[PDB]
Amino acid sequence: DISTEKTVESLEAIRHRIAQIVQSLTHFLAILHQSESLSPWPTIHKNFNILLSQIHSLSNNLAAHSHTLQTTSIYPSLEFPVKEQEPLLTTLLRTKALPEVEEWEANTLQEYEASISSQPKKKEANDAYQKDQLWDQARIIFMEERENYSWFRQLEIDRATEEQNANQMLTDILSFMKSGKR
Amino acid sequence: FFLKELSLTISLHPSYFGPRMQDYLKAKLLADVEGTCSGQYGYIICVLDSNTIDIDKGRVVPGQGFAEFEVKYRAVLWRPFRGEVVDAIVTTVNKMGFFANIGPLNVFVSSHLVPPDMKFDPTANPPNYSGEDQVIEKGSNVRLKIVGTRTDATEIFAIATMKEDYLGVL
Amino acid sequence: DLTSIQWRMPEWVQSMGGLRTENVLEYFSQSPFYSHKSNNEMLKMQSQFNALDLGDLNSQLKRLTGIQFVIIHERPPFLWVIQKQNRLNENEVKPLTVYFVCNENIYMAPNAYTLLATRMLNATYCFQKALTKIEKFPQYNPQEGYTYPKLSNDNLEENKNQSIEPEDFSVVRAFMQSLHSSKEAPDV
Amino acid sequence: FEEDAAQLKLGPEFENEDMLTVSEAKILIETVLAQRARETNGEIPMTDVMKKTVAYFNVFARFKTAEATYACERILGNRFHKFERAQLGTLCCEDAEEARTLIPSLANKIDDQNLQGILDELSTL
Amino acid sequence: SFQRQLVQRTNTLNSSIDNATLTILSRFQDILDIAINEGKDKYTVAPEVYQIECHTVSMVRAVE
Amino acid sequence: EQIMIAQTECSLALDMTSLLLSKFKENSIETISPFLKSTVPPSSLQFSRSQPPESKESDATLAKCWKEKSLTSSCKFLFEAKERLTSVVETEHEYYTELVKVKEASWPL
After folding, report:
1. Options 3.40.1050.10, 3.30.1490.120, 3.40.640.10, 2.60.300.12; which CATH number does B1-81 get?
2. Are C80 and C19 in contact, with CB atoms under 8 Å apart?
3. CATH 1.20.5.790 matches A153-182
4. Do the Cβ atoms of B127 and B77 come closer than 8 Å?
5. How far is CA C12 from CA B155, C29, C108, in A?
6. How many structural domains comprise chain D?
7. Nearest Cβ partner for B82 among D5, D19, D53
8. Bridge-partner residues for C69, per DSSP?
9. Closest alpha carbon within chain F to C160
């Protein structure tokens, strides 16, 4: 019975993240619309950073949420208009991406298979688990060398102390130029 | 929140008669009333200056040299009353109650006025009052029903409860 | 394949004049979406045996185990909800896809995650594509800063503070402002 | 003397006055600020009362838009009880039974069906 | 004081160094975290490219 | 253009997901694009319980090859950026050598 709660809740978080990235990118495009000419490139990178925050939280919400989503299936209910409103919803039921880009994925399959034509029989994935696992260990060794390091004088503040009493010594001679007490 | 008409007297000084008094009177008004609070009208959020700003008078003082300019103005005020339901923003959570916060007024929800399903947890990462899945920490606007209000020194303070239906976590 | 694609043989509907009740599973039987070891089809085999013993549908169906295409939400005269399922008992049900009358088409209902992944992938693809045939044109310099080479720049054409001790409009802006004041200057 | 809750009861002047809306209130505040800025040196202390409101107002933007407010206004109409009005547009959700509980003063004031219809319009807004 | 001028100035310099250099550190660091493939959906593999992009570009950026 | 397509498609994500979550909470459908509420009533979309649904080798294969292409893209990035940066060094150095001719010859700066 919890799954409906998973729907309203986790999809509330999702639609929230969408509400972020979309309208925020409207703000983005508007920032682009500021352009009499040149775009602020570093700002653009900052925008892409914010996008990294978006993909961060979104990928975060993919999580075990997909474990529930895989069983899910969209369908319009009783209040959905029937006469000819459907086809746009069929597009909403249409999971199809960019046909050129799906063609691109097909290109990746067929051309990796072309690499297979260059390399007729060569398994790698089994030890590729140790490819990524060597990434997994070498990252740790990398962190080791990181932790080994020293990281970032204060004496400069004490240089002010040289002029501390020198100001007090400034008080000294003036007291002589004043009182002249010996 | 209300939009009402209030009065206030500005006692101007000769030094500022010039030829643009109107401006001075308006500037002085904003400064004296905005941010203030009374038990009678409550928090004077801000004054709807412009168009809704009347400047009558005034009659100079005999033994003072200062003239009193009566002013009628429209303002946004926030006055609370026992029995009103409002959304608040929890600020702190102590085994003493719930230190919420609505706008500019501070609302205290005595622990004794909180359901018996919300046990107090001080060990939990951040002191909170869960039950009962529902977890109310220092970041969860709750719904309360003002039970009693007080006005001590222009300032206002009342207590709210969570005993009725449809109150609590939002 | 199972999404927004044509699969129509309208003349069948032209004969039927449209759907009624069980006849939806007729044109659906014409559809690939129809299953052969569905209880609709194994008890279609029952129609090839017992024939008479099928009732409407759901009585003969759900009481018997296997794949089924039960009806629940009519939407006359176009849509009709018909979910796929798998009974494991005369009582138990294990529902599958909601096949639906898309009118001269019936489709499996897509995962939300599928289209969501489509959105994520296409969006991040727009990001990466923004990084593709665009990046590395503003070449960096500590001194010159980012640079924008051209056969001709036109079109148009953390440092230092203290230094030596247009307005393309010929103050035309204020002149236009004065035009605003002056168009009704006689009038105002 | 008068320290009840009601049930619509308390100060007469305040009762007479119309309770400003949340989103609309914030919009008006914004408008006011814009008019003031029209010729400012820079700064204008917002004291402490401003900060709080600025937060609560944004944390309750039941109409983050200049038109949202107008839409809401259009949807409404019948006064009934300034308070109740602003209260209904400040809470939201959802069923009748719930409406009475929150605003017992509604007793035999309005029906139901209608209420439900209004809630649906708000949720979609 | 003339002291805090040059002192806070140079402190801004080293702080900026901390900024860009730590940027290079973490951005080069987490690409290694990005290396994971198995046990994750292919569509979840898609973001990782953009992740690596932002990390490396952030690196050369911080270098600049 | 591209951001228009993807981002507005995401707006459709927010809108239709709002159509789904409008079955219960009303503080969700509110964010839909203005044309939609004028048209289709909320709470229209509804989820169905169905299927694993399916899986294929293209999943793992693309999951590998795309990461390969990604890390290699990082390599090309680091190397060609190394080129442009080295060139920037080659350019920038002349300035401060001429500034050896300046400051190391004692001139105002």
Report:
1. 3.30.1490.120
2. yes
3. yes
4. no
5. 80, 12, 22
6. 1
7. D5
8. C84
9. F109
Tell me the CATH class for A73-116.
special
> What span, in angstroms and rounded, lies between the C-alpha atoms of F105 and F93?
17
Phi, psi of B42 (to 5 degrees): 90, -150
| Contact: D124, F25; criterion CB under 8 Å | no
For CATH 6.10.250.2610, list the domain ranges present in chain A. 73-116
Cα distances (angstroms) measured from residue D80 to each of A103, B77, B84, D8: 62, 21, 17, 11
Contact assessment for residue A154 and residue A161, using Cβ atoms and an 8 Å cutoff: no
CB within 8 A of C17, min separation 6: which ones? none
Q: Rounded to whole angstroms, what are the CA distances from B83 to A42, B98, D15, D90, F36?
A: 54, 18, 14, 15, 39
Q: Which CATH architecture has domain A1-72?
A: Up-down Bundle (1.20)
- What's the DSSP call for residue C95? E
Nearest chain C residue to A57 by CA: give it.
C120
**Contacts with A125 from chain F: Cβ below 8 Å:** 60, 64
Q: In this complex, do F63 and E35 lie within 8 Å of one another by their Cβ atoms?
A: no
Chains in touch with F (≥3 Cβ pairs < 8 A): A, C, D, E
d(CA C58, CA D28): 61
Resolution in A: 7.8
Of A79, B143, F37, F70, give the one whose Cα is nearest residue E49. Answer: F70
Is 2.40.50.140 the CATH number for B82-170?
yes
Which residues 6+ apart lie within 8 Å of C77 measured at CB? C18, C19
Q: In angstroms, what separates the C-alpha of C164 from chain F's closest C-alpha?
A: 12
